[PDB]
Amino acid sequence: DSHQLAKALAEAADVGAQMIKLVGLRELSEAERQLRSLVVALMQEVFTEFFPGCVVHPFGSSINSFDVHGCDLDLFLDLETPKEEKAEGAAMLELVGSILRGCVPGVYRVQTVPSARRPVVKFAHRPSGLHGDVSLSNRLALHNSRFLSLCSELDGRVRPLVYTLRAWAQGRGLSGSGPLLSNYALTLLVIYFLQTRDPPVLPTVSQLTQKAGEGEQVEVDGWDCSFPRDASRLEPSINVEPLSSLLAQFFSAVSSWDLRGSLLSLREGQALPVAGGLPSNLWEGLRLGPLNLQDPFDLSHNVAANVTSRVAGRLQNCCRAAANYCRSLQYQRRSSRGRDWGLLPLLQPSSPSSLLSATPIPLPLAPFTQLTAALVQVFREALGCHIEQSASWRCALWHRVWQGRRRARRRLQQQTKEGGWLATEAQVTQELKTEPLLSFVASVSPADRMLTVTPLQDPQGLFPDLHHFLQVFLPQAIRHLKLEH
Numbered sequence: 420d421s422h423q424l425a426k427a428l429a430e431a432a433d434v435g436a437q438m439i440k441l442v443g444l445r446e447l448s449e450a451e452r453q454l455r456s457l458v459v460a461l462m463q464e465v466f467t468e469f470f471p472g473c474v475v476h477p478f479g480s481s482i483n484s485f486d487v488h489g490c491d492l493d494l495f496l497d498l499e500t501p502k503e504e505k506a507e508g509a510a511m512l513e514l515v516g517s518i519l520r521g522c523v524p525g526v527y528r529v530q531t532v533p534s535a536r537r538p539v540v541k542f543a544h545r546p547s548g549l550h551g552d553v554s555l556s557n558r559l560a561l562h563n564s565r566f567l568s569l570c571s572e573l574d575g576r577v578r579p580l581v582y583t584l585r586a587w588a589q590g591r592g593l594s595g596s597g598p599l600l601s602n603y604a605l606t607l608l609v610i611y612f613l614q615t616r617d618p619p620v621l622p623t624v625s626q627l628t629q630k631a632g633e634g635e636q637v638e639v640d641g642w643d644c645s646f647p648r649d650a651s652r653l654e655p656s657i658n659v660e661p662l663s664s665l666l667a668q669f670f671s672a673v674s675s676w677d678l679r680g681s682l683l684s685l686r687e688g689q690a691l692p693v694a695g696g697l698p699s700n701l702w703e704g705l706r707l708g709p710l711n712l713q714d715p716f717d718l719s720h721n722v723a724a725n726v727t728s729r730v731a732g733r734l735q736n737c738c739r740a741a742a743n744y745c746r747s748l749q750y751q752r753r754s755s756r757g758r759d760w761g762l763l764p765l766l767q768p769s770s771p772s773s774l775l776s777a778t779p780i781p782l783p784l785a786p787f788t789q790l791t792a793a794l795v796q797v798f799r800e801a802l803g804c805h806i807e808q809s810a811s812w813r814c815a816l817w818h819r820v821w822q823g824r825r826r827a828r829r830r831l832q833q834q835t836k837e838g839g840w841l842a843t844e845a846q847v848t849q850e851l852k853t854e855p856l857l858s859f860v861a862s863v864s865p866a867d868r869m870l871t872v873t874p875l876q877d878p879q880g881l882f883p884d885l886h887h888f889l890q891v892f893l894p895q896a897i898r899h900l901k902l903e904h
């Protein structure tokens with residue numbers, strides 16, 4: 420596809436046409452949906468044989484309109500009370516597993532996951548080549564999937580935006596299993612972005628809840644899931660901004676936002692100040708961190724709560740870079756013949772140097788001023804860097820200093836047999852030995868305190884080595900400098 424898709428997007432008229440074509444290409448065909456329906460029908464048959472009156476509800480990527488090729492098939496099986504109710508649940512889970520493993524034909528790789536936040540049973544159907552999860556209870560997943568598809572129905576730009584930004588995110592390494600953003604979290608971030616535009620593209624979940632209607636009220640796990648089943652009773656958006664504009668605006672927005680001190684509410688369509696303690700007092704069980712994104716229904720759940728500060732910072736970095744790219748003429752204007760334009764450089768893999776310079780380096784806690792002073796102390800001395808003027812400095816290195824420190828250290832130890840930090844490391848540095856060999860930039864943001872090291876001039880391409888070496892070296896430096904007190 421990486422060939423076919425590339426030339427397909429290259430031939431498009433404009434950026435919007437590229438995003439639309441991207442949706443058209445990545446989404447499940449009719450045969451894939453028929454196949455998934457077949458599998459769901461089978462699971463339904465067997466589970467019916469076991470649990471009379473049970474209903475297998477497809478949820479997630481399948482029904483939320485954000486479906487892509489090879490996506491998971493997620494199924495929800497609908498059928499003195501202490502913590503034991505957890506154990507009971509687990510039991511039932513295994514029961515379901517034992518049904519999947521030995522009863523329904525052609526399903527293998529059956530793996531019970533009671534340990535997960537939301538308990539689930541992984542499975543793979545062999546003939547269809549499909550895989551996914553059976554959840555005994557996640558009821559909210561249904562309703563917020565319906566909410567996603569409804570959001571797609573509310574504005575036609577939603578699907579192109581979300582598809583493009585998902586592709587970009589997985590291309591920039593912002594989405595995955597680790598403390599990366601989930602596709603659902605990223606989708607909710609896009610929806611939040613669309614809700615926060617000056618004319619709103621999408622309505623808030625509060626407004627949809629108000630829209631409601633008789634009998635359409637629904638409550639799950641003590642949360643209000645009620646929203647209209649169709650978009651016909653809902654007035655359209657007067658925001659006329661074209662797709663490319665909304666994309667650039669996304670990048671710029673999430674790059675300019677304050678994530679640490681903001682819980683992003685899709686319900687109220689607003690940024691609620693985190694510090695101190697305000698949203699935490701209302702809905703208990705809300706874990707706050709580098710990125711805070713509130714579920715539209717369960718308000719005690721931060722969907723991004725898993726994301727580490729390095730990942731959030733990397734997000735904002737990549738978004739600043741992408742916004743900077745969209746400001747160019749390569750993004751706006753098409754190419755005469757064969758050149759990469761518009762969406763292509765965004766969906767193309769990022770250089771290893773950019774790959775590293777996007778994700779910052781976590782530094783020990785310390786006063787911003789004292790920390791920055793410590794850093795310029797570590798670059799000035801203990802490193803051969805010539806330094807000059809969130810705080811940022813331009814640094815120039817004429818030397819190989821990151822490499823061969825071990826040999827100089829050995830030499831200095833045996834020559835110590837002959838006869839705290841800072842200057843002692845500066846010995847190791849200066850004993851390692853006019854256009855600069857490598858010139859780079861070091862930036863420390865207020866929140867969190869982290870160093871973003873980006874290259875300027877790198878003729879021989881040595882920047883990644885310096886970056887990894889600094890990843891190891893700078894925390895040690897700040898550490899011993901903290902221990903001098």
Ligand SMILES: Nc1ncnc2c1ncn2[C@@H]1O[C@H](COP(=O)(O)OP(=O)(O)OP(=O)(O)O)[C@@H](O)[C@H]1O
Nearest residue numbers: 479480481490491493560561563564601602603722
């Ligand atoms: N990290 C999460 N926190 C809370 N709810 C989630 C999370 N991830 C997914 N969900 C809910 O359950 C569904 C899980 O689907 P899944 O884990 O397969 O991701 P997805 O959105 O379906 O995309 P994909 O299928 O490609 O992973 C989501 O659509 C959402 O309804």
Ligand SMILES: [Cl-]
Nearest residue numbers: 671672673675
């Ligand atoms: Cl903004």
Ligand SMILES: [Mg+2]
Nearest residue numbers: 479480491493
């Ligand atoms: Mg899915």
